[PDB]
Amino acid sequence: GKVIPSIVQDYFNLVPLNFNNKTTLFKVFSNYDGKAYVLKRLPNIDKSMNPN
Amino acid sequence: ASLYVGDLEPSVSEAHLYDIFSPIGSVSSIRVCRDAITKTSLGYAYVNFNDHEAGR
């Protein structure tokens, strides 16, 4: 039921883990690799002005 | 009345160009160009003058 869908940024089937890294700990099967990965959101910052 | 200054490093600030070009003449202003998104310099700059003699 996540507002983020499965297919986001070369990854899909985003299922979570326990609350507070109630998310930022995502079990994800990979698109490019095909491998179980963990994801963390950092769902609070919004400014990364330098890609440098 | 102005100058383009190319072949520069993104770590070269305006003070280096000031230490070069204020001995030439009256520097009106300096601006080093960056990208609007990366906030990373583009390797060149501009030094506005006011007189033609210092520009030449």
Tab-separated table of C-alpha atoms in Angstrom:
chain	number	residue	atom	x	y	z
A	1	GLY	CA	0.000	0.000	0.000
A	2	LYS	CA	2.987	2.337	-0.218
A	3	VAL	CA	2.590	5.581	-2.166
A	4	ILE	CA	5.964	4.696	-3.612
A	5	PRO	CA	5.262	1.936	-6.153
A	6	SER	CA	7.379	-1.118	-6.848
A	7	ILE	CA	9.197	0.153	-9.939
A	8	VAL	CA	11.239	3.081	-8.610
A	9	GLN	CA	14.750	3.877	-9.899
A	10	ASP	CA	16.016	0.516	-11.224
A	11	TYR	CA	14.427	-1.366	-8.293
A	12	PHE	CA	11.102	-3.035	-7.646
A	13	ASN	CA	9.036	-5.134	-5.206
A	14	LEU	CA	9.800	-2.768	-2.322
A	15	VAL	CA	8.757	-4.540	0.865
A	16	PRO	CA	9.736	-3.048	4.222
A	17	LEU	CA	11.331	-4.181	7.454
A	18	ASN	CA	10.778	-3.136	11.087
A	19	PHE	CA	9.841	0.438	11.939
A	20	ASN	CA	12.272	3.399	11.863
A	21	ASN	CA	14.955	1.747	9.677
A	22	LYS	CA	7.722	2.813	9.916
A	23	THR	CA	10.198	2.487	7.062
A	24	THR	CA	13.763	3.250	5.801
A	25	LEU	CA	14.497	-0.475	5.889
A	26	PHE	CA	13.326	-1.962	2.590
A	27	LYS	CA	13.872	-5.499	1.339
A	28	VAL	CA	14.146	-5.119	-2.438
A	29	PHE	CA	14.716	-7.596	-5.236
A	30	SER	CA	16.872	-5.904	-7.834
A	31	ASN	CA	16.225	-5.123	-11.496
A	32	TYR	CA	19.779	-4.558	-12.719
A	33	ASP	CA	21.391	-7.189	-10.498
A	34	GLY	CA	18.622	-9.522	-9.361
A	35	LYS	CA	19.727	-9.551	-5.745
A	36	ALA	CA	18.149	-8.923	-2.345
A	37	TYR	CA	19.143	-5.449	-1.137
A	38	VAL	CA	18.299	-3.177	1.775
A	39	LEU	CA	17.221	0.419	1.202
A	40	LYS	CA	17.061	3.360	3.581
A	41	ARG	CA	14.930	6.397	2.812
A	42	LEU	CA	16.349	9.382	4.674
A	43	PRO	CA	12.781	10.706	4.351
A	44	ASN	CA	13.436	14.043	5.966
A	45	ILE	CA	16.104	15.972	4.087
A	46	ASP	CA	15.180	17.567	0.790
A	47	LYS	CA	18.221	19.596	-0.338
A	48	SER	CA	21.290	18.131	-2.077
A	49	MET	CA	22.215	21.213	-4.133
A	50	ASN	CA	25.672	20.002	-5.180
A	51	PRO	CA	26.030	16.741	-7.116
A	52	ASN	CA	29.745	17.533	-6.713
B	1	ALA	CA	35.104	47.441	-20.379
B	2	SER	CA	35.030	43.672	-19.840
B	3	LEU	CA	37.061	40.515	-20.383
B	4	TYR	CA	36.407	36.847	-20.879
B	5	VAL	CA	38.919	34.688	-18.997
B	6	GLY	CA	39.033	31.027	-20.004
B	7	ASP	CA	41.083	27.933	-19.142
B	8	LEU	CA	40.412	28.039	-15.411
B	9	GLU	CA	40.006	25.493	-12.627
B	10	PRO	CA	36.772	25.322	-10.559
B	11	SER	CA	38.929	25.797	-7.435
B	12	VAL	CA	40.179	29.119	-8.848
B	13	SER	CA	38.079	31.701	-7.007
B	14	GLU	CA	37.577	35.322	-8.057
B	15	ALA	CA	40.448	36.415	-5.789
B	16	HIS	CA	43.060	34.747	-8.023
B	17	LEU	CA	41.760	36.650	-11.050
B	18	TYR	CA	41.649	39.761	-8.873
B	19	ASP	CA	45.307	39.307	-7.919
B	20	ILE	CA	46.154	38.886	-11.609
B	21	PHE	CA	44.001	41.567	-13.251
B	22	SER	CA	43.826	44.374	-10.679
B	23	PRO	CA	47.587	44.938	-11.250
B	24	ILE	CA	46.546	45.483	-14.889
B	25	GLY	CA	43.926	48.103	-14.110
B	26	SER	CA	40.684	48.987	-12.367
B	27	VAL	CA	38.673	45.790	-11.981
B	28	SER	CA	35.008	46.759	-11.935
B	29	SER	CA	33.701	43.246	-11.213
B	30	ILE	CA	34.488	39.528	-11.527
B	31	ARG	CA	32.097	36.590	-11.958
B	32	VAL	CA	33.067	32.921	-12.303
B	33	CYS	CA	30.489	30.906	-14.207
B	34	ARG	CA	28.830	27.872	-12.646
B	35	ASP	CA	26.062	25.476	-13.589
B	36	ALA	CA	22.583	26.347	-12.347
B	37	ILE	CA	21.986	22.822	-10.980
B	38	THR	CA	25.287	21.244	-9.900
B	39	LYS	CA	26.598	24.506	-8.350
B	40	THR	CA	29.923	23.505	-9.906
B	41	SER	CA	32.037	25.979	-11.874
B	42	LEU	CA	32.311	25.702	-15.649
B	43	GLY	CA	36.035	26.413	-15.992
B	44	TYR	CA	35.892	30.060	-17.100
B	45	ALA	CA	34.931	33.518	-15.887
B	46	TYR	CA	34.445	37.179	-16.755
B	47	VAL	CA	36.080	40.330	-15.429
B	48	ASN	CA	34.141	43.479	-16.229
B	49	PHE	CA	36.361	46.553	-16.571
B	50	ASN	CA	35.386	50.165	-17.269
B	51	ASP	CA	38.214	51.582	-19.435
B	52	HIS	CA	39.526	50.410	-22.807
B	53	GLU	CA	43.199	50.910	-21.870
B	54	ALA	CA	43.125	48.377	-19.023
B	55	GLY	CA	41.228	45.953	-21.262
B	56	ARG	CA	43.840	46.193	-24.026
